Design a protein around this ligand. Structure first.
Ligand code: HEM
Length: 368
């Protein structure tokens, strides 16, 4: 369908951990990024790679793992240790297979949330539940970068959201078949699940250190669009002649908030305002099936107009409960951005303004 899993939602279920042996040289670099970046051997190892055909990656899961592998290597290659010594040309023997794979998966050739969070995890024990204690990431960048904590907590938020996402068909089927009680129950269930997702979001503090996120991890998630360090973009050697710009926005490419904006008829992509165009651009960095899901929801009849047309206080309160849970998520997200980016930075205003307008637009959708 739309590659939305009942249990893990937008996340990739049971991600592949190992590539075929043909790709051992890629996997070795990706698995040893902390040591290779620290010593300074990372870039030489990449420049020494043979060109490996992507022909031995034949299913979605091995393609997604290879994208995660190549994406981590690319971020490490471009940024190095993170102190201004950058590389402006990605060597052909990585760029060509990376771009070909990205074309097949319909994603930009840069590390994205769908790689480093949605595909970057495993269960320690397959017979135990999806808890931090029973999970790990597949790749990290530097020792002490809190990639395990940041990636896995984001993933646990996605998983919590899966419980609301799976109710969405019930919502549209109830509006269709005129089942008022069913719609009301479904909206309450969504609000309840979104409230639980907010509680899971609190775990960012349990597992992510602000200094480590801002000064280490954020470097490798950063991109080359409007970046003075790579003002023209990156040269994907042997694929495109001229450099191309792509955003590094892993920490804000989730489909979850936009999913419920569209569900609830909140028009965040409306107009030429900068917030709309930024949220529209983020979609290009989501998996195509998830972009298609978001567009399908926009094309369905409006949940908001349905609730507004019925003179039904119970329905309006269920709907408002959903909007308020989304407002609560975005408000806590603002707090997080303050603790993990702005405070460490000052020891910017466009970022917080963008986030506040998006929350404000959400808050304006309340009926009461
Ligand atoms: C340490 C934790 C986090 C930090 C520092 C952070 C940072 C940011 C930043 C800087 C942006 C602006 C766009 C960008 O620069 O990429 C953003 C937006 C966004 N973030 Fe995060 N983020 C964090 C955790 C999360 C989590 C766990 C989620 C959801 C699972 C999330 C979902 C979003 C979304 C959906 C947006 C788009 C704006 C919106 O729709 O309200 N973030 N975040």
């Amino acid at each position: 369908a739309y590659h939305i899993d009942e249990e893990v939602g937008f996340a990739l279920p049971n991600p592949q951990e190992n590539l075929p042996d043909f790709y051992n040289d890629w996997m070795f670099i990706a698995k040893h990024l902390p040591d290779l970046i620290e010593s300074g051997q990372l870039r030489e190892r990449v420049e020494k790679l043979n060109m490996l055909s992507i022909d031995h990656l034949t299913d979605h899961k091995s393609q997604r793992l290879a994208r995660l592998v190549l994406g981590c290597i690319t971020m490490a290659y471009v940024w190095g240790k993170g102190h201004g010594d950058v590389r402006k040309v990605l060597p052909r023997n990585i760029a060509v297979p990376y771009c070909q794979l990205s074309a097949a998966l319909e994603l930009p050739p840069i590390l994205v949330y769908a790689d480093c969070v949605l595909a970057n995890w495993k269960k320690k024990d397959p017979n135990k539940p999806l808890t931090y204690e029973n999970m790990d990431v597949l790749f990290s960048f530097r020792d002490g970068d809190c990639s395990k904590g940041f990636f896995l907590v984001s993933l646990l938020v996605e998983i919590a959201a899966a419980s609301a996402i799976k109710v969405i068909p019930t919502v549209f089927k109830a509006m269709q078949m005129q089942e008022r009680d069913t719609l009301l129950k479904a909206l309450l269930e969504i609000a309840s699940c979104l409230e639980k997702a907010l509680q899971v979001f609190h775990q960012i503090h349990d597992h992510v250190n602000p200094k480590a996120f801002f000064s280490v991890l954020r470097i490798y998630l950063s991109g080359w669009k409007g970046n003075p360090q790579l003002s023209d973009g990156l040269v994907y050697e042997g694929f495109w002649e001229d450099p191309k710009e792509f955003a590094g926005g892993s920490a804000g490419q989730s489909s979850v908030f936009q999913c419920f904006d569209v569900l609830l008829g909140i028009q965040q992509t409306a107009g030429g305002g900068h917030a709309a165009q930024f949220l529209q651009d983020m979609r290009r960095y989501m998996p195509p099936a998830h972009r298609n899901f978001l567009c399908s929801l926009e094309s369905n009849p409006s949940v908001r107009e349905f609730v507004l047309s019925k003179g039904d206080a119970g329905l309006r309160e269920a709907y408002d409960a959903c909007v308020k849970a989304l407002v609560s998520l975005r408000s806590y997200h603002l707090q997080i951005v303050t603790k993990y980016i702005l405070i460490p930075a000052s020891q910017g205003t466009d970022l917080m303004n963008f986030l506040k307008t998006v929350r404000s637009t959400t808050e304006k959708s309340l009926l009461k």
